[PDB]
């Protein structure tokens, strides 16, 4: 029954019963569950042995072991929580020591026995019957949990930092499809005026850290953007529910993190006197017994609102399905290392003077922030690098490495804390670029920095216009952020967008005079006086296109793929910079019933507004191609044929991908979300071939839009919240300024 599966999840899984296999046989394990007298008999003799070894420190060991057992079952977090038997033996944070107080193996067997007695009496009865009538079935399930633990333990012992912070007795648990629980500040959430969130509680926190008023917010079942929930989506390998190398927790949800050195030492001496509050702080311990970070816990009561599922058979399949996937991501990095070694070997062999353009990554690094990230690199990749290059050797090209670290010139904050954002100078540059390219009216509504979009529309027709301008605005901004992260300086884009916009606008107006000139030429069959003027007119304006800086793109045909397909009188507005007024003209051609429908209108694919948006989207990609082509030739020193080859491998044709959704459903914004996703796959694939260093750095050095989740509550970006059709946001302040991740391997598989 459904109860037996849930009971087995807490029994075999959450109690870390795989530990007993080290010393007790399978037959002896089953007798423990079927008799409550044996459980109290084993604890009686175990405490006597540990008391002798611990000696004067037996009281502290017993107190910590019981507290950890309470968390393993009821989820309650105490004060100065130690998450495993390795940290309990050293008694971190209580008494200094030069080694383990008692045997780790004996302590581990004691903790799992303490938590076994904490299970409900009704639940323990179910396991007793299964262990006596289902001997064959129960033994296989126990043996399956041994394999899961050994694989998880094989990765934990590699680094000493992750060995002291991993969680004992970890098993995945899945939430309900649709629900979403977040923790956010009360003052900031008030101005959002979201109608899909309700307050179910308040965050008391703790006396160690003082902060503003927070609270819990819950959203009932609905439809969310794809890949935004349901799977872990982390980009770094995990062992025991924590990140490998750093020890930060990722398998569960936390309300925040504190990593600043001056702030950490202020918390440590404040907690010496005492701690009070419903949600204490979990400390992260170093390799020498110091404290390097603090984390804010979550009340276990609020986790009941999520209606989590704890089916034992299903969770094991999810567990093994994630270890296999994480093993492939490590192997991909290993293969990428071999390619980097081959490149270094040939250059040195060709000439001994080529060693002056290589930088040793594992050597001495002068930059302190970069050096710290290298130290916390996964130990599995370090061994592979030392196998080929040699001990403490990793040589990469200097110029290619500099393109991987261009983000930090415009980004501030720490990704691990969860407050990474663009510098204030960068926003003032991007904001002025959007005003020039788009209309002044569109910038005022879409890019308002004080009010959301939904608070500025007070008509049924205006919603149709506003819901259309967003689609090209998001695409325009998503390309700017993507090129900045790939190494393009922010100064090049600022001084080139106004220049390239004028060239495109001039070409459209110049083309209009010569497209109809063919009709004049056909009608000029007669005296050469009209022919002479017509002959000179076409040739005079043709040479104007020859001197254009965008001429090579025009010759290739990509820049003129849709220019010569068709031209409209009202299409001049999109070239001038009147995008907002352009959408109004196409919206007035809709039927009166559809126009007055407000947000319930179902825009058909045959209307003028549907095709008008497609032209604007493809016009925005025209500017992106010009900037990409210029960079690959001016500052990269590549041939003209080389740059054109790369441009054609990063863009797709939108006419081959129509919508394939249900009828009677509003899916105008969801269709464009999938089209943008496909283009991101093509970009990621070309990054691996043309920049091996950036692929390896992206999964080592932390960077904005380079790492996945960090255990904090899920935060959406422009792409995620566009597909849901919501309107309670703005692309100028707070939420909506974040771009999706740029990890090459992550985008390929997720």
């Amino acid at each position: 029954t459904d109860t037996e599966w849930s009971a087995m999840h807490t029994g075999l899984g959450k109690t870390d019963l795989a530990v007993l296999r080290e010393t007790m046989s399978m037959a002896e394990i089953r007798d423990l569950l079927s008799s409550s007298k044996k459980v109290k008999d084993e604890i009686s003799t175990l405490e006597k042995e540990i008391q002798n070894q611990a000696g004067r420190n037996w009281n502290l060991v017993q107190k910590k072991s019981k507290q950890l057992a309470q968390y393993m079952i009821m989820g309650e977090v105490g004060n100065n929580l130690l998450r495993n038997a390795h940290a309990i033996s050293r008694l971190l944070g209580e008494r200094i020591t030069n080694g383990p107080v008692a045997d780790v193996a004996a302590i581990d067997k004691l903790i799992t026995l303490y938590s076994l007695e904490l299970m409900n009496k009704s639940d323990r009865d179910l396991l007793s019957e299964l262990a006596q009538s289902e001997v064959e079935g129960m033994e296989f399930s126990i043996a399956y949990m041994v394999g899961q633990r050994t694989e998880e333990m094989r990765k934990a012992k590699g680094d000493n930092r992750t060995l002291l912070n991993h969680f004992k007795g970890y098993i995945p648990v899945e939430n309900q499809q649709g629900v979403n629980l977040i923790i956010a500040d009360d003052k900031e959430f008030a101005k959002l005026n979201s109608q899909s969130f309700t307050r179910i509680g308040t965050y008391q926190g703790s006396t160690g850290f003082r902060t503003g008023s927070k609270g819990y917010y819950f959203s009932p079942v609905a439809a969310r953007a794809p890949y935004s929930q349901g799977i872990l989506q982390n980009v770094r390998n995990t062992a025991g529910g924590v990140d490998i190398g750093t020890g930060f927790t990722l398998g569960t949800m936390v309300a925040g993190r504190i990593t600043d050195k001056p702030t950490v030492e202020r918390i440590t001496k404040a907690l010496a006197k005492g701690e009070r509050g419903r949600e204490p702080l979990m400390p992260i311990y170093n390799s020498k017994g110091q404290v390097v970070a603090y984390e804010q816990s979550v009340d276990p009561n609020m986790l009941k609102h999520l209606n989590q599922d704890n089916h034992f058979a299903k969770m094991v399949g999810v567990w093994r399905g994630r270890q296999v996937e994480e093993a492939k991501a490590q192997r991909f990095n290993d293969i990428l290392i071999e390619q980097l070694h081959a490149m270094y070997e040939k250059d040195i062999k060709d000439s001994s003077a080529n060693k002056s353009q290589y930088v040793n990554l594992l050597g001495k690094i002068d930059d302190p922030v970069l050096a710290d990230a290298i130290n916390l690199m996964n130990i599995e990749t370090r061994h592979k690098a030392e196998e080929l290059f040699g001990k403490d050797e990793l040589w990469v090209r200097r110029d290619m490495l500099n393109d991987a670290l261009g983000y930090r010139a415009a980004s501030i904050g720490d990704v691990w804390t969860g407050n990474s954002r663009w510098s204030p100078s960068t926003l003032d540059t991007v904001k002025k670029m959007f005003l020039g390219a788009f209309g002044n009216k569109a910038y005022h509504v879409v890019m308002n920095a004080e009010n959301t979009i939904q608070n500025l529309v007070k008509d049924a027709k205006t919603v149709i216009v506003v819901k259309a301008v967003v689609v090209p605005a998001v695409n325009f901004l998503a390309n700017i952020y993507q090129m900045i992260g790939r190494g393009v300086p922010v100064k090049d884009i600022a001084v080139n967008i106004p220049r390239k916009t004028s060239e495109i606008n001039q070409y459209i107006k110049s083309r209009l005079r010569q497209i109809d000139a063919e009709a004049e030429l056909r009608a000029a069959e007669g005296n050469p006086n009209l022919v002479r003027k017509l002959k000179t007119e076409i040739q005079s304006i043709t040479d104007s296109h020859r001197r254009m800086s965008i001429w090579p793109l025009i010759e290739a045909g990509e820049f003129s793929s849709i220019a010569d397909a068709g031209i409209s009188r009202d299409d001049l507005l999109v070239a001038e910079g009147k995008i907002h007024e352009y959408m109004e003209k196409l919206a007035n051609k809709l039927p009166e019933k559809v126009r007055n429908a407000g947000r319930y209108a179902l825009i058909a694919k045959d209307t003028a507004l549907f095709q008008g948006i497609q032209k604007t989207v493809e016009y925005s990609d025209f500017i992106a191609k010009a900037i990409i082509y210029d960079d690959l030739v001016k500052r990269k020193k590549k041939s003209s044929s080389e740059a054109l080859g790369q441009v054609t491998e990063e863009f797709i044709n939108y006419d081959r991908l129509p919508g394939r959704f249900r009828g009677y459903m509003e899916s105008m914004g969801l269709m464009w979300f999938y089209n943008f996703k496909i283009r991101s796959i093509k970009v990621a694939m070309s990054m691996i071939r043309n920049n091996p260093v950036h692929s390896l750095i992206a999964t080592v050095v932390p960077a904005p839009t380079m790492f996945g989740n960090v255990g904090l509550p899920i935060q959406d970006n422009m792409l995620t919240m566009l597909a849901e059709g919501r309107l309670d946001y703005s692309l100028g302040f707070g939420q909506g300024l974040r771009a999706p991740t740029l990890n090459p391997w992550f985008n390929l598989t997720h």
Partner: protein
């Protein structure tokens, strides 16, 4: 487990109207015709003597 009792107390408050702090009657009546857990509890309640003639 303290969380088991906390959730049940949460459901009792909404039915009693403490959580929702009038349009409260339509919400309760609408909920009584959809929820499969509240209906099971209600069907065991004794019928008032004035409605014994209806037999429902």
């Amino acid at each position: 487990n303290p969380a088991d009792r906390y959730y049940a107390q949460q459901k009792y408050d909404t039915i009693s109207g403490a959580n929702l702090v009038t349009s409260l009657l339509p919400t309760f009546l609408g909920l009584a015709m959809v929820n499969e857990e509240l209906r099971s509890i209600i069907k065991e309640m004794p019928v008032p003597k004035a409605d014994k003639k209806l037999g429902n």
